[PDB]
Amino acid sequence: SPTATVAEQGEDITSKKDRGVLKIVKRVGNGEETPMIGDKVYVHYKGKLSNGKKFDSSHDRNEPFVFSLGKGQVIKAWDIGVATMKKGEICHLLCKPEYAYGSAGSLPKIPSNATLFFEIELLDFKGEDLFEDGGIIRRTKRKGEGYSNPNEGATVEIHLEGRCGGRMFDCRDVAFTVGEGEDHDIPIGIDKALEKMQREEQCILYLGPRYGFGEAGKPKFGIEPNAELIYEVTLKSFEKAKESWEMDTKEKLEQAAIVKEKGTVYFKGGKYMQAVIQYGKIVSWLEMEYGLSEKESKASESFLLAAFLNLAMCYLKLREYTKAVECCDKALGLDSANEKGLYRRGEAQLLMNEFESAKGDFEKVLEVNPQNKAARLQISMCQKKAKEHNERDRRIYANMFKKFAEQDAKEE
């Protein structure tokens, strides 16, 4: 009976209009919002053949069927069908073999040229989480074309529309460099998302507090500190930046001078995220080089040493103490008795409560320069903060073993 009902009163949802996918709404649902291309979709379903026999099911509620929409993970009829459903909706689908398994079928279960009946319930749907941190959520409007994606340093041509709490503050066509969106009043989330987009792609981007304008806000757009933003991005065209190995030594040394200066402009203005991107190019280009002339080696090593010391400074400011230490380790591997590298390693290790490692770094600073005032003051600070930390641990341990033993005696 319900197979004949959809065959008679079925809404054709096909572009070519060939009655290949016929739909009937059993349960209405709620919301108005329907799933988009790339969305993670949660469903319950039943599958029947022309004779009425059940071939597949997932209604048990032990586990629903989870997949990505408009990607060819399911039959054509599902990619067309599910895209038309509101949340909580139950529908019926009559699918022709042209939108299902065709002439080959899926033997032994699905025979050749089989018209399939489906009962689908749309449980939930979420947009795609680009960096698995809830920071950048993508909803695709139009699929792009192409082999490549923009890389950091690539030049791009985009159409951009930006909203904050429903209010539009930006609507324009803009040409800029990936990693340097800030030069054109674009937040970092856009630069990060572009690396995952194809030419002619159109999508919606939900930018969380980490990927927007941040704590300072954006006064000219009336954007408050850590406000959530919603953008519409169309990638019109792009020209990729050369990779590290595609550049000769002469070009790497010319560009090192340019991006070091750009990194320093960002640092002076407190744009530490942007300074890291610039100084990081120097490391990428020159760390693994060899076979250089005496003159090329001396200049390459000089750039390399300053880039690690500068990155360590950026990371202390960004409160990323592990990255600060790693940058000082690289600097000290080039220059064993670098005063700046040893002091900065001490500052970062002390901030991570590695009191013994920090003490050692500040001592080696005094071995290099006994005229260092701050170095001696920080050793006493390591001493004072290690004692305070041990008194704290002893208090928590005694309180926890007082708590655990009192709850243990209450049980008995």
Numbering used by the authors: 13 to 424
Quote the study that presented this structure, word for word:
FKBP51 is the co-chaperone to Hsp90 and belongs to the immunophilin family initially recognized for its involvement in regulation of steroid hormone receptor activity. FK1 domain is active as PPIase and known to bind to the FK506 and rapamycin inhibitors or modulators. Inside the cell, the TPR domain of FKBP51 mediates interaction with EEVD C-terminal sequence of Hsp90/Hsp70 molecular chaperones.
We solved the crystal structure of both the native form of FKBP51 and in complexation with the C90 peptide. The elongated shape of FKBP51 leads to non-uniform crystal packing and therefore anisotropic order and diffraction from our crystals. During x-ray data collection we noticed that the diffraction pattern was quite anisotropic and therefore, decided to truncate the data in an ellipsoidal fashion using diffraction anisotropy server for the complex and the Staraniso software for the native structure. The native structure has R and Rfree values of 0.198 and 0.247, respectively at the resolution of 1.88 Å (52% spherical completeness) while the complex structure has the R and Rfree values of 0.192 and 0.262, respectively at 2.49 Å (62% spherical completeness). The structure of native FKBP51 is already reported at a resolution of 2.7 Å33.
